[PDB]
């Protein structure tokens, strides 16, 4: 199969072809990952829980995101990759675009910054030159009508500024259908129902390596199946047949 | 010969003589592309691939740059010298004279750097400073994350707009890549600095290539925009000699390399 | 259960109870590991292959090491913390040191280095100065380019006799741990028979006081046909943390590593 | 073909099979050079003059040559990557080590430096340490060759270069040695053969260099010539007397 | 308990529920106040004094705020983790937001700094990238030098409550009054929505704050008149740190011997 | 009173009068320890543990312990100030001394490092470039990990020989049997200071954290218990080491 | 005596007392200053030539001053410590508040820079950040090379016109203090009146609030016009500094010999 | 006059001319000073104290000395200009190299450092390769051991501090070398005080030269010209 690219996204969207994303921090599991059909690897500051074991993202670094996408970017997958800029790196236009190019150097194609319109100068200046934007709005983890409201001003601000993807978390599920039906790119749940463009997860829930209490967002596709492998290939399946999410993973 | 220099470029387009631009990245090829009268070396990017082996153009530093740079100039060429500013050190326009600054100290007599007419005030700041500038527009490979252009009437149309901006804001020279060739021929009539074609067709004011590619240094199938100049040649000299004329008699590039 | 300790190991082999060892690069898999009893988990150099997708070790550094190891140790496991000294890092009695103090403030509670019996003043300097080494011949995968790859260690006369003698040294020396790695199981078994500290096995065999795998190779993340010594506990199990046990189990049951494991 | 390994030029020198080796600073040659079943690729000093336009290798730094090296390991040839340590980087066996280090983790699988006798110590440390080592050397005069050459090879190398030595005094240290040869301007009695890429690509103003061959002069393309340069190593025909020192 | 967020701070204010602040610059201090239950710890620049055995605060850096914030972060306190810009830290947005997070990859959950409505810029450009603030009007001991209590005439009292409404119009969820007159300090209260912390402002705020050493007696002769040393009889240090929240909780602290 | 040099140290010990040393890291308790008459204060690597609120002590580096005894010299307390070389920092003699140095810049007059009979030509070095050090044996917490008799009591008296003769000045004995310590105090001629070493030393050393009741550890009692302040929770543990009443068979081996 | 702060020497111009300055670089001198109740100890860039033998006080650097304000510092005088900004360290506001700043954690608790009314948003700048601003005009010796020399600077009608609107113009930015260098002493008398804040001559008459001299000037360890050698005839350094003070306080120093 | 150097010390050594030597850390100084016809001018770690406040000399940097050793230098002094290697710089041979020719190439024409007999190879380290040292030692007959020592090794000056007077007279006669004295009383070849405490700017080794002349100049030419007569030091300021 071809790369996967930000512009092949677009054309999912338009086709009905739900994206299937998963956070990425190695080669190993890029490998396995694109064997399995993955679209989109997010190499993101939820690493600074589930390999750093911090109880925030707040400590993570830029050169720690540098690492992991270096990493993952030596397997060479198929995936689009894209990394995020953490806490901290973007408080200007000139220091998210430093930060941008330092990962894209590293091998990332995408960056990932969580704001809402407040961002929106922002995004122009990093995709006037040249960096692919994902956005990201709703509960930011660096972080009702009138809530609804505002998320779908974020969203619309920073697709006008030029972001071509765009992450949506812990949103109720019929706010995130109207947020994917107003806007042209495609958006990406997590904790925001099925009615998205596509699904992301943090690698490490759903393949159920946490103890106890499971997140209301995650499923386990690793329970029951023969292998890592076959627990990532049913999540893209799930996620590409409507079945993931369920009603119970809403918000 | 003397040393060519930016008014020797534009004098060579105001009397119908073609440019020949190669790209070269060390001392010894600067001496045999200089023994073969390529008229314009340029250190660029492309060395991320050709030399360094990555997939694209993205991880090549400004140190990188430097580097060839120096390699190159070391040779005193009679050339013009041409080195690339790399993705991500041309943000601003403080960010991009800076940069300039550094290749040129190194031995650049001028920089590239790719992107339209947003880039109007960065050509501005740097020129008002004394940096030559070539612009560069069409298919901008450090933008291959983002993205032949001007392939849409709308496509074009704002292709030849960019191409005006840069000039405008103060471009001596102007690289055009991966156009369909009618389009570079409107844009080369319409500007008054020299055009530098690849994948541009004929109708520029001259040419540039990837050495190693014209050189047949590449497994397979040929990018169709180049000719193995080196393929029945009796040295890699002859090869380089056989390029210069070939632009210069208005030969290379043929249909076939044309889109 | 208590903390494993560096004597808590050398009471194991007088007890019999095999000591179960996996690599372990985060803080995620250091918990899961710890809930599944491994005994000691590795920060290895391993994870140049595993997570930098590199040919060979050799570009891991010491500051890799160290920010894996931080990982590792914020999880706080109960399992004794290991951490490979690169390669590079430890060529005179000085750097070596050097090297491990970076590695403990880290997290590391021993490290683990490479060589044969030119190792031996290097290890009595650690040792001095209250760094505990685990040593580490046979097969050492740092010398692969003077090896002409990863090749079985042992297979003549000659090979078997300098292997023990590397092991003799490196305990007299004041190692309280070793790894053997890719040796006949007839050679290792008399090495563990010589030594009076624990042996810990990589395609070693299985008379040997312990295992070790890479935890990805365990965890059967790999495709194609695998290296002999390799066992996939994943495939079979209904959970990640069931595989893990499973490794725990049949290292402490004697059934792994196999004859189909072993040369 | 698989890998080539310092201990497949070994086996190479028992079969008579003749070792061919080229300098390489960059990824599109270091494929082209693998294409065309080059043994041996060597990240020289030589740089200095044929890239960098030195007029000696002097100014050559550790990490002039850590660059070059990183190029061609990218490519990931099957051929060994031999890297030089620069002058001036070997001056203690501690230095001589760091600097290898930095060379492998850069991608070089063994380490050249070139002196006589007094290296043994340093060559020993290397090797000890793991770090794979070709030497690089050249009536008395042939007496102290022979004894520099004996004593790298006691103290570890498993590859030498001769550089500029009579034919026949380099044919005696090839029979003598028990490690494969490898010549420049040292005659055809070695277990192989190294030139300097841009050498024998023709790239150079004027005569050529005594101890070179052009093997582009009429070849087809670059690939063909590189073949041609490795089919005459190994069969025999390269260096020719007009080669010789 | 649940870890006490910048939103039940609020939550507090609008129950009535007192809260209880102190500085803390360690984490055997940290783990003592939290079992104790105070609400919000403070690495303060204080510890120039209490720690350094500087004459002021001036010399305390932002690496020394942020080698104390970590220790008082590895003790997982639930009380929020509060720590200060040091005076010369926050003297542009960019240079604020820079210091901030430095600290808050340190462990700290919120900064405070000290200013009054000249900083409305620097709190919005702070609040909007997600860092949460701590205003800190009235005597502000960074600027000592340039003072040689603050708010005793009605021009004083005045521009503090300009101060105090332009630094919560910006964004700002808590702000610390340093010696106010009880009376005047009362007016901000009432007038602002975010939760107001005394310290020699009187007990007519939302919270209190004071710095450990000063409640836990360790200094010799008169001391402050807006300090009580909650120690001296107790039967523990532990228990000491539970008299001061319980007193700031039950109105018994501050009195109105410690208040201007 | 008068500075508290090493000389007095001696003289204490030849005059039976016990030395109280307590850690201390800053200098509110630097004034306050002062206050109470505390002979040593010492800039211990335990800050690891009750400041910083890592596991063990092997985080701490040597710009750490600088800050803690720039921050005690800062109070200038008339009491000896000594200050631990952290675990890693006294690999060789070259880099003992320069690590003291840089201590000794700080504030510190005397610096201590955990070592046996090995540490000899170390110990030499140091002093013969006028660096006092305080020697310390036992349990050395550094060793926390290779830790995991009627030898190792022979041992133990061997190494603090070794150190003595080499120059140390003052020792710390740590977890070590009452008899056996009591047995290198009348052997050494240097003073000894013991922390679960038993009464039959020249002085005594707690962790202020611990002696404050802010945590209960065997050799260790809670000064704070049954006193009105922190101040006299402090003079409650000098008045007890010079009477000899604490420690108390409770606290020793 | 209490610490001699910058509220205090506003209240010594408004009670007729002169404020008695001195350049100070060392602890045995700050010491001993103290001891003879010099109000002011000012750590100068004129240690470039005094200190350092340079001929000017162009090389003179941010740290070298850091450093000899620590020295000063570090014997806790009750006089105000006031420390240079050095020439090329205050070229944008942001550019002195770092400088100052760096002063500021060594110990000075006020600083002073050279120049005109172009200096009005730089000293605002600093101010409002709460850092004292001691202003300077006149013959300002950082700007030797663009006057050809040390040239008393007034002379001119136009001259002693820019003087005025200078000082007006650094006192309405929010300097507390201002150094008169070498002006005629009628011109330093108008500047005096019109102003507010206290002036500080130096080489400007009688006609200011303040003298200032360079120490080693005084000590007689060089005469200039307007130093007088308070040494000569003295039975120690103490009793020299101390006849400075007097004289300075009486009215006696300058005398028309020592002004232009 | 002529610039003093280190073989013009041991002439006057040798004629009976007592070397009057004094602390000086900047440029003015150093010129007075010089026009009191002070023969060594030292670049003291003494400056912890009186310039720095410290307590003690121990945080005195080698940079620190670096500092004033050029402000000294810049104003070209005749004076030998003597700088101190500090506690912590001389560790081993190489690191007292490195650190002294830190400070000839700021000015220094001679280092000193402190220390006995173990000091000898360090010594013999600096001189052979053309450093200048004046060695600084101060029971009785290990004394006379590390002057001998040092000597031995090559310095060509030496510091007694704090050594009663008879024991100073036997070491001064024992050595070739001139012996500067501090507390050390007047049987040595010269005598140093620190600046500041000569002017009066505060020892029983030290008198204040400065109460009751009429200048500073006055009181170093004081000072100067009662070594060189032999009536300072005292007995009231020995050891
Ligand atoms: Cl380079």
New interface residues.
């Given amino acids: 199969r071809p790369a996967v690219?930000?512009?092949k996204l677009q054309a999912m969207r338009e086709a009905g072809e739900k994206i299937a994303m998963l956070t990425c921090y190695?080669?190993?599991?890029?490998?396995?990952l694109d064997?399995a059909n993955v679209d989109v690897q997010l190499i993101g500051d939820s690493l600074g829980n589930?390999?750093?074991?911090?109880?925030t993202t707040?400590?993570v670094?830029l050169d720690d995101i540098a690492?992991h996408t270096?990493?993952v970017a030596?397997?060479?997958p198929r995936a689009l990759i894209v990394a995020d800029l953490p806490?901290?790196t973007y408080?200007?236009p000139?220091d998210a675009?430093?930060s941008a190019?330092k990962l894209?150097?590293?091998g990332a194609?995408?960056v990932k910054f969580?704001?809402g319109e407040?961002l929106a100068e922002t995004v122009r200046?990093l995709?006037?030159?040249?960096?692919?934007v994902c956005a990201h709005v709703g509960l930011?983890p660096?972080?009702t009508e009138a809530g609804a409201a505002q998320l779908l001003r974020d969203a619309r601000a920073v697709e006008e500024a030029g972001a071509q993807l765009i992450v949506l978390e812990a949103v109720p599920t019929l706010v995130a259908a109207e947020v994917t039906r107003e806007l042209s790119i495609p958006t990406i749940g997590i904790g925001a129902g099925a009615e998205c463009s596509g699904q992301v997860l943090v690698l490490?829930d759903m393949?159920?390596?946490?103890?106890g209490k499971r997140p209301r967002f995650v499923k386990d596709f690793?329970?029951?199946q023969?292998?890592?492998?076959a627990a990532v290939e049913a999540y893209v399946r799930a996620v590409k047949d409507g079945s993931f999410p369920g009603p119970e993973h809403s918000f």
């Fill in positions: 690219t930000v512009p190695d080669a190993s599991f890029a490998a396995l064997r589930v390999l750093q074991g911090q109880t707040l400590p670094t690492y270096a990493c030596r397997a060479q806490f901290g408080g200007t000139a675009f430093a190019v894209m150097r590293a194609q995408m969580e704001g407040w200046f995709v006037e030159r040249a960096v692919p930011t660096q972080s490490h393949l159920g390596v946490f103890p690793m329970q029951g023969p292998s890592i492998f």
